[PDB]
C-alpha cells in the first residue's frame, strides 16, 4: 500500500528450489532501562549431532541480530538507548544469517522514522565491518520476490552470476556494503 | 573492525582460511565478550553416561581473556565481539592466538599484517600450544594468497621444509606472535612513533 517505518521484505529458501518472501516487522521504543533486543519467530538455538557427540550454539538468526547491533554502534547509533523487538509473523520456525541486512535496515528505519520502500526485497549476511556476505538460494529467492510483486531485489555482490541477467521483470541490485542497502531503500 | 586470518581443517586433509572479525568498543555498561559463529557447548557419550562442557572454542576465548589480563589489559573496559563468518558451527582451541592478536590489535589500534595467517592454542601463561591439521592449514593459507603462516614451535616437523611459496614461522609465545604480525602504525599527525 505504501513505504512504511520498520517493515522490510526479507527472503527465505526451504531446500534447493523453493523460495518465499517474509514481511519482517521492527519496533523500537525508548528503553525502559539498559536497552534490550527481542526477536519473535526465529530459532533460538541449533544442535548438530552424531551417534556419540553433539554441539549446541545460539542460532545463526540470533547471532545475525548481534552482528546487526554491533554494525549500528560502529555507525554511531546506540541500540542500548532502545528496547528493540523484531517479529517474523506467522509462527514459522526460521533460521540462518541471510536476514542480517533486512533486520539492520528495519532497525535503522525504526530509529530514524524513515520508511523503507515496500517494492524492494533483500537477502544478505552482514559482517561486523558492514560488508554484505554471500547467501544461499539466491535464484529461488529472486523468483519468490518477483512472484510476490516486488519491483526490486537486493543481493550480495558475490552472489552475482551471468544467469541472473537472464531474469525478466525485476530489478536485481548487487551490494557490497550495508550503506549501499540504505541508499537503495530509504524514502526521503 | 579488524580482521585476523585464522585457519581450520574439515576432515583429514581439507583446510580453509577464515577472516575472523574483531570489534572492540569502549564498554556501554560493565563491558562484555560476545562470539558469533562458534559451537558453545559439546555433549559426548551415550544414554548410559554422557558429559557436557563448554566448547573448546568458548574455553579458548576464556584463556585469551586471562592472557590479556596477565599482560595488564582490562578486557572488561570493552564490549568485544568476534564473528567467525558464514553458517558452519566452528569449534576447537586452535584460534586462541588469532583471537588474542585481534583483540590486542583492536585495543592498541596497532594493525595486523593482512598477508599473515595463524593457528595455535594459547595457554594461560601465553605459551602457544600444538594444534592439529598443520599441513592442510598451511596449504589453505598458501591457496588464499597468504605470504606467511604462524604455527606452534612443537608443530615444526622436517616435511614442512618441503612446502614452497609460503614463509612458515614457528612461535613459542604470544609476544612472538605479536612481534611477527603487528605492523608499525601510521606516523602522520602523531606526537611520537611506536616501532615493533
Ligand atoms: C532468518 C532467515 C529468514 C534467513 C534465511 N533463512 C533461510 O532461508 C532458511 C534456510 C537456511 C538457509 C541458510 C542457512 C540456514 C537456513 N529457511 C528457513 O528458515 C525457512 C523457509 N521457509 C519455511 C521455513 N523455514 B537466509 O539465511 O537464507
Ligand atoms: C575456532 C576454530 C577456527 C579453531 C580450529 N578448528 C578447526 O579446525 C575445526 C576442526 C577441529 C580441529 C581440532 C579440534 C576441534 C575441531 N574445524 C572447523 O570447525 C571447521 C572447518 N571448516 C569449516 C567449518 N568448520 B582449530 O582448533 O584447529
Ligand atoms: Na534472506
Ligand atoms: Na586455527
Q: How far apart are the C-alpha atoms of B62 and B103, rounded to whole Å? A: 13
- Are the beta carbons of B174 and B126 closer than 8 angstroms? yes
As given in the structure block, the three cell numbers for residue A75 are: 555507525
CATH code at position B71 = 3.30.230.10
Rounded distance from Cα B98 to ligand 4 centre (Å): 8
DSSP collapsed to 3 states, A94-111? ECCCCCHHHHHHHHHHHH
Q: How far apart are the C-alpha atoms of A4 and A24, rounded to whole Å? A: 12
- Cα B87 to Cα A84, A107, B32, B192: the distances in Å are 25, 23, 23, 43
User: To the nearest whole angstrom, how far is the Cα of B80 from the nearest Cα of chain A?
Assistant: 9
- List CB contacts (< 8 A) between B22 and chain A: 128
Q: Is residue A26 part of a domain?
A: yes
Cβ within 8 Å of A, B 133-192: none
User: To the nearest whole angstrom, how far is the Cα of B40 from the nearest Cα of chain A?
Assistant: 5
- Are the beta carbons of A115 and A2 closer than 8 angstroms? yes
Q: How far apart are the C-alpha atoms of B150 and B122, rounded to whole Å? A: 13
Rounded distance from Cα B65 to ligand 1 centre (Å): 34
Q: How far apart are the C-alpha atoms of A153 and A121, rounded to whole Å? A: 5
Q: Is residue A147 part of a domain?
A: yes
- Cα A156 to Cα A125, A137, A180, B12, B69: the distances in Å are 8, 12, 11, 32, 39
Contacts of A114 (CB under 8 A, 6+ apart): A5, A108, A186, A187, A188
- Cα B150 to Cα A133, B61, B147, B153, B157: the distances in Å are 27, 19, 11, 9, 14
Q: How far apart are the C-alpha atoms of B177 and A27, rounded to whole Å? A: 45
- Are the beta carbons of A11 and A141 closer than 8 angstroms? yes
Q: Is residue A56 part of a domain?
A: yes
Task: For an interface test with A, give the residue of B87, B91, B102, B103 to mutate (most A CBs within 10 A).
Answer: B87
Q: Is residue A2 part of a domain?
A: no
Q: How far apart are the C-alpha atoms of B150 and B176, rounded to whole Å? A: 10
Phi, psi for A169 (deg, rounded to 5): 75, 20
- Are the beta carbons of A56 and B41 closer than 8 angstroms? yes
**Facing A55 at nearest CB: one of B3, B23, B39:** B39
Q: Nearest CA to A45 among A56, A30, A32, A37?
A: A56
- Are the beta carbons of A171 and A152 closer than 8 angstroms? yes
User: Cell numbers 522514522 correspond to what residue?
Assistant: A113
Q: Is residue A16 part of a domain?
A: yes
Q: Whose CA is nearest to atom 7 of ligand 1?
A: A12
Q: Nearest CA to B155 among B169, B174, B140?
A: B169
Residue A92 Cα to chain centre, angstroms: 16
Q: Is residue A1 part of a domain?
A: no
**SS3 state at A172:** strand
A56·B41 Cβ contact <8 A:
yes
- After which residues does chain B show a gap where C to N exceeds 2.5 Å? none
Q: How far apart are the C-alpha atoms of A42 and B67, rounded to whole Å? A: 36
The total domain count for chain A is 1
Instruction: Give, for B41, the enclosing helix (H) or strand (E).
Output: strand B41-45
Ligand 2: residues within 6 Å at CB? B 6, 8-10, 16, 18, 56-57, 88, 90-95, 131-133
**Would you call A172 exposed, middle or buried from its count of C-beta atoms within 10 A (0-12, 13-18, 19+)?**
middle
Q: Is residue B91 part of a domain?
A: yes
Q: How far apart are the C-alpha atoms of B101 and B109, rounded to whole Å? A: 11
**SS3 state at A155:** strand
- Cα B24 to Cα A100, B73, B83, B108: the distances in Å are 20, 13, 12, 10
Q: How far apart are the C-alpha atoms of A155 and A180, rounded to whole Å? A: 11
**SS3 state at B175:** helix
What DSSP character marks residue B132?
Answer: S
Q: Does A46 touch chain B (CB under 8 A)?
A: yes
- List CB contacts (< 8 A) between A80 and chain B: 28-29
The torsion defined by the Cα of B129, B132, B138 and B144, in degrees rounded to 10, comes to -110
Phi, psi for B31 (deg, rounded to 5): 75, 165
Q: Is B142 annotated as catalytic?
A: no
- Are the beta carbons of A43 and A154 closer than 8 angstroms? no
- Are the beta carbons of A65 and A44 closer than 8 angstroms? no
Q: Nearest CA to B38 among B13, B24, B68, B59?
A: B59
Which technique was used to obtain these atomic coordinates? X-ray
Q: How far apart are the C-alpha atoms of B5 and B22, rounded to whole Å? A: 11
Q: How far apart are the C-alpha atoms of B68 and B64, rounded to whole Å? A: 6
Q: Is B76 annotated as catalytic?
A: no
Q: Nearest CA to B90 among B44, B54, B38, B137?
A: B38
Rounded distance from Cα B168 to ligand 4 centre (Å): 14
Q: Whose CA is nearest to atom 12 of ligand 1?
A: A96
Q: How far apart are the C-alpha atoms of B104 and B112, rounded to whole Å? A: 10
Q: Is residue A146 part of a domain?
A: yes
How close are the terminal C-alpha atoms of chain B, in Å? 21
Ligand nearest to the CA of B8: 2
Note down the domain range covering B147.
Answer: 2-181
Q: How far apart are the C-alpha atoms of A22 and A136, rounded to whole Å? A: 16
Sheet with A45-49, strands from edge to edge, namely A45-49, A53-58, B41-45, B50-54
| Cα torsion B172, B40, A82, B29: sign | negative
Rounded distance from Cα A132 to ligand 2 centre (Å): 24
Amino acid at each position: 500500500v505504501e513505504p512504511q517505518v520498520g517493515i522490510v521484505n526479507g527472503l527465505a529458501v526451504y531446500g534447493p528450489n523453493s523460495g518465499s518472501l517474509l514481511e519482517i516487522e521492527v519496533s523500537v521504543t525508548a528503553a525502559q532501562d539498559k536497552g534490550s533486543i527481542n526477536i519473535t519467530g526465529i530459532a533460538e538455538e541449533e544442535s548438530i549431532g552424531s551417534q556419540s557427540k553433539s554441539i549446541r550454539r545460539k542460532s545463526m538468526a540470533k547471532g545475525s541480530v548481534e552482528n546487526v547491533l554491533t554494525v549500528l554502534r560502529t555507525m554511531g547509533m546506540k541500540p542500548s538507548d532502545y528496547d528493540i523487538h523484531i517479529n517474523f509473523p506467522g509462527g514459522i520456525p526460521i533460521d540462518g544469517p541471510s536476514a542480517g541486512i533486512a533486520m539492520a535496515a528495519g532497525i535503522f528505519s525504526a530509529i530514524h522514522k524513515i520508511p523503507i520502500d515496500n517494492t524492494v526485497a533483500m537477502t544478505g549476511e552482514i559482517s561486523l565491518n558492514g560488508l554484505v556476505k554471500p547467501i544461499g538460494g539466491v535464484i529461488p529467492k529472486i523468483k519468490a520476490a518477483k512472484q510476490s510483486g516486488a519491483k526490486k531485489v537486493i543481493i550480495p555482490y558475490e552472489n552475482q552470476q551471468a544467469i541472473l541477467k537472464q531474469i525478466d521483470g525485476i530489478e536485481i541490485i548487487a551490494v557490497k556494503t550495508f550503506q549501499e542497502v540504505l541508499d537503495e531503500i530509504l524514502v526521503n
